[PDB]
Ligand binder design. Structure first.
Ligand SMILES: ClCCOc1ccccc1
Length: 162
């Protein structure tokens, strides 16, 4: 298991434009296209992302290319964020994957406001962290996914993904 395999499980793979759990146009392995309700707007973003006229369909290779970029960007975002970086640096590699997973899903601004959870993670109070993480819109809207990510933070193992 690793961050790629982990997010592949959490996000799925769809080769045509679909709506994500929030109702936003998305493609590939959870590549958010736009928060706009316009399908045409989404197709424009898709074409710009891939570099050709796709008419809303991409290949698996193209999906994996965006996915790699998205993971890279999430990591790079964490490292450029003054609140996230020290917590990330403090973690082992398995818990780092859980951190990336959350940023991938909710964006770095969103996760940077998990102030109390971030502190518990830095402190390595894993059970406390796991309790605090669940007290969130995130947990309530995507409980099965949140439960997997929380278990990963709590245990530093891949148990929730085997
Ligand atoms: Cl507090 C739940 C998120 O934990 C993170 C820790 C480090 C970087 C990004 C996220």
């Amino acid at each position: 298991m690793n961050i790629f395999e982990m997010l592949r499980i959490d996000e799925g793979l769809r080769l045509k434009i679909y709506k994500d759990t929030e109702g936003y146009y998305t493609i590939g392995i959870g590549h958010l296209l736009t928060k706009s309700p316009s399908l045409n707007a989404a197709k424009s973003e898709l074409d710009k992302a891939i570099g050709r006229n796709t008419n809303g369909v991409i290949t698996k290779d193209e999906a994996e290319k965006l996915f790699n970029q998205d993971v890279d960007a999430a990591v790079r975002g964490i490292l450029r964020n003054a609140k996230l970086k020290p917590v990330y640096d403090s973690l082992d590699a398995v818990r780092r994957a859980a951190a990336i997973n959350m940023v991938f899903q909710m964006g770095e601004t969103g996760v940077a406001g998990f102030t109390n959870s971030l502190r518990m993670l830095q402190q390595k109070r894993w059970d406390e962290a796991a309790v605090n993480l669940a007290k969130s819109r995130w947990y309530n809207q995507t409980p099965n996914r949140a439960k997997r990510v929380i278990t990963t933070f709590r245990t530093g193992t891949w148990d929730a993904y085997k």
